[PDB]
Point group: C5
Amino acid sequence: DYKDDDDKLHSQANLMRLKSDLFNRSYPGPTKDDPLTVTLGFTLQDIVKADSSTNEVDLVYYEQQRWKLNSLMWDPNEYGNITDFRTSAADIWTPDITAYSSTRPVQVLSPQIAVVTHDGSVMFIPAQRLSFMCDPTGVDSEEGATCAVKFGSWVYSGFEIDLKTDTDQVDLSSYYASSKYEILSATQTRQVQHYSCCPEPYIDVNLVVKFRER
Amino acid sequence: DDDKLHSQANLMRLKSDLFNRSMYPGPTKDDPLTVTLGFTLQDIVKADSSTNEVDLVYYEQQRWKLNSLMWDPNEYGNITDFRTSAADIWTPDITAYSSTRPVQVLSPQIAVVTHDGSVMFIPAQRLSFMCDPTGVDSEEGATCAVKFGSWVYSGFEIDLKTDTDQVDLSSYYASSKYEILSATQTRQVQHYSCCPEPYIDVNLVVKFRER
Amino acid sequence: DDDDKLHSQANLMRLKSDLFNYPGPTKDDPLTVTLGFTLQDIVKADSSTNEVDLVYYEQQRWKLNSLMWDPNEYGNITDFRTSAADIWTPDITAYSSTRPVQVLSPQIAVVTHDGSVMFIPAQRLSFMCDPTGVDSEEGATCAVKFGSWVYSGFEIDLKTDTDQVDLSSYYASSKYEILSATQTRQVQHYSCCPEPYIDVNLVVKFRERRF
Amino acid sequence: DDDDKLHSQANLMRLKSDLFNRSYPGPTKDDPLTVTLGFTLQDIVKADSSTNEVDLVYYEQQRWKLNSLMWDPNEYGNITDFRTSAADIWTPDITAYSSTRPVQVLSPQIAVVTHDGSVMFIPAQRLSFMCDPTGVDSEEGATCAVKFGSWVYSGFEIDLKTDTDQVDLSSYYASSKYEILSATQTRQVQHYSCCPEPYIDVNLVVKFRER
Amino acid sequence: DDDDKLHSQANLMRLKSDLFNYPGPTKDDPLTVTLGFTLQDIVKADSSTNEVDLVYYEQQRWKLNSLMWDPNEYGNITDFRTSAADIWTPDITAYSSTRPVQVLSPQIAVVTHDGSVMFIPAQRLSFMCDPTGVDSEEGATCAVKFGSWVYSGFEIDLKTDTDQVDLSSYYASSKYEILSATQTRQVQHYSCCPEPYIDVNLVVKFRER
Ligand SMILES: *[C@@H]1O[C@H](CO)[C@@H](O[C@@H]2O[C@H](CO)[C@@H](O[C@@H]3O[C@H](CO[C@H]4O[C@H](CO)[C@@H](O)[C@H](O)[C@@H]4O)[C@@H](O)[C@H](O[C@H]4O[C@H](CO)[C@@H](O)[C@H](O)[C@@H]4O)[C@@H]3O)[C@H](O)[C@H]2NC(C)=O)[C@H](O)[C@H]1NC(C)=O
Ligand SMILES: COC(=O)[C@H]1[C@@H](OC(=O)c2ccccc2)C[C@@H]2CC[C@H]1N2C
Ligand SMILES: COC(=O)[C@H]1[C@@H](OC(=O)c2ccccc2)C[C@@H]2CC[C@H]1N2C
Ligand SMILES: *[C@@H]1O[C@H](CO)[C@@H](O)[C@H](O)[C@H]1NC(C)=O
């Protein structure tokens, strides 16, 4: 009725005001004094192509990214019980998580939209097709081939951005059942590197996939 | 000539009243939206048995209705609908769940808005998706499927529906390398252990064989 | 002498400011778009996917009262070149493409004082075409319709000046020779709806260049 | 000395602001422009006899002069030239008339502007164009040609010139799959049956053979 | 507690505001760009077109007086990360590419309080290279020069810290093994023209593994 109509109008107004209060009335990225931990997890959907002439393999996966900022916190009571909202990834800071051994620019398969929750947590899940350095020799064997690719910030050291995983098991529950390649194992493991150049520690998540022709 | 100038004026006024004035932030649990989807399959262009990818060309009809897009035609020279850039309005984030390449858009990004607040948007797309074409060279043919739905909105914010579960095949290319044996489009509701919300998709299932 | 050149520059800048400082056609204010093709090359015929690649220049012409001016009010300027982004342009689309059109020319149009616009995009188009018989005397025949994506014949009409495609610039050393090429206005109806839909059907008969 | 360097930056920022922010609508019949063109051919990368397309890599030197880009160096700390993004200034729409794919740009889009109003802009490009490479595997080689000129400006608005009819081969890749027998670049006044006003082009003719 | 973090953010926002409120190098205000390559992979060698595809990280470093600050004035901030669109970057270009470079990393740079900027684009490059001999003990040798497209040595000098390409990240299971890889500053002089031209010549000797 008129009341219900008003409730929907109010909710829209509350959401606009919240987004206004948060964005254009107020993030420069993490710092050594304010470091950020980004949680990463992979959902491997398909090994599309294994190219033995170039040693490039093409994966399709969803990369779940999570982080939390005090600057994105709000009290739902102050905004009509809004507890989360969807917003363009361009409206907010997002981490520069990059494959370290790609051979072509990553191709994005999903909308650039994130979910922000009232505790300041952000969830962003880009689907990607990636070509990366991988020798598929042995893919036509019982033990298959094994390849790996590291993901992490391009420009922030372990001083500013840390990474974590919730599990070292890649999510395979959406893996394409009729892929040319069957997955024997898939793991995701945080690593901390020290290079002789630099005093800063460097952090990545290493995606290791063991696979064979089905 | 002055009559047409007035019609031009009424349309510019309508669009400015609706857009450059008035703030729809997308759907929410308190203001949920139903998007109607329908496919018109034009061609299976390519089936790649080395990678198990198949390439489709189709028109994806999308329809939804917003109170914020309603007007009284009597206040605007009896204008009952208009065409506008899809960039001028909210559009749903309907995504193929098992694509293997970014969708390629084949048509202009323009929508039709009607006075009741309904919007119709029909992007033509070329899609590569995960599909094993084994059997395509047999009488039984091959069967593949791809789900479409919102990437970021659950069934609490966006629901989906179809007007028919039969894919429109009236524009299917008569001399395609592949003949269609059947094509269906079916709403599915899924509940996951992770999550209390329902998740909705439209499953496009195509059975086809070499012609 | 160069004083005159400064004055002509200022007049043109003032004209463009006055014109640019249109919501598309409507049933009350319909527009006729004239189309014509200049076929330059059949680049590729792919029998594995039934796609053929053409390179052509597509002539588009239309006329808007809103683009009219009196040359005497603007230092006798009769026409100007401008970015296609500065003006409304018709959403003329191939109906059976299989890849996005690739644009081969600058997106710049010519506007004349009577409000007429001429815009000539060069394009490479892949479209649905079975090239069977291309290696024979009779050759292969394919066709592709072009028209508005979103406007009916009650908002945009189409016309051609001739039903003969211009072949005078067709590449003399193409892999494919043209047997004929026509461009024909068609009026289509769909069962749901009383309004006519208009397209221009490009039909090309061709064979491999070699009794 | 660091004071001097700060002054130089200030002077350049002020010059650019004066030229771009506080001050050209392209050439016209009253104010026509001459563009000088010159090609430096770097490589014939690929010759495709299946589609009759050949791929070139070259640098295209473009030079023109505008009164609107003139300054007195004395008013700007003796600055005689500057580099600037090609987006900041008008640039000519020089286009290959027989490309089969959009040209791919290989160099930064930055031009050099000199105090007399002259501009030099040298885009490196990879171009696929219409070319039958028959004879490439013989002593006499293959011959192909491609015209470059304005897409939309007739010879009444844009004229072209060359400094030499000899293509610069001094940077030609010495281990290319193809050796160059000759390469010429020749101004032409080109009449099209579509159009009463001629267009000016520079015709690049390359004779080449497998190494 | 969190007031400390609220302060550091405010300090960084203040710094970025003060710095971003430069027209490129000139003969009067010249710049030095240091370049270094980390060669990751020879992906493809195409003997039908004489094009070879490299993947590498290209380190670029320069310093601007205009980007200097005292850390003590901004809560001891000594560096920050910023979009490469926020700042001037050098027009370093391969001189014999055959396709546009494809960028594999985010366009973000690090600015340090001494005015130095480090920008490290990862790239895939196709360039002119004849792979003949790659299947022999001696392998094949190719080369590609990198340098500014529009600035002479009077505006941008180039240099390398070492003439040895960094091979410590070279892909161990590449189709091609690297025999040597050098990056060498070259100065070119022409009779027409007073100005020196500078490039860094990347020379790679490689063979089938
Ligand atoms: C925008 O669109 C609206 C809606 O269609 C138009 O408004 C209509 O205008 C027509 C034409 O003037 C009207 O038709 C006339 O209706 C009369 C009776 O009207 C009463 O009854 C109707 C229905 O119950 C009510 O809607 C209305 O409010 C009235 O109470 C007839 O007597 C008229 O017939 C006579 O005139 C015609 C010529 O016009 C002759 O040919 C006949 O022989 C006869 O002498 C006539 O049919 C209609 O009532 C209006 N509809 C509504 C809903 O208001 C606008 O005209 C249109 N344009 C603009 C600019 O707004
Ligand atoms: C800004 O670029 C980097 O820091 C990269 C890289 O940096 C370099 O390779 C490099 C090269 C020359 C000088 C300094 C750093 C190290 C690790 C691996 C990828 C990424 N990274 C965090
Ligand atoms: C505006 O487009 C043109 O003038 C093109 C072309 O125009 C046409 O082909 C054409 C066809 C029909 C009507 C008007 C122009 C003429 C020459 C060749 C390419 C380009 N041009 C300089
Ligand atoms: C345009 O030309 C006509 C020719 O008589 C002339 O009368 C008129 O003054 C000119 N218009 C101006 C604005 O230069």
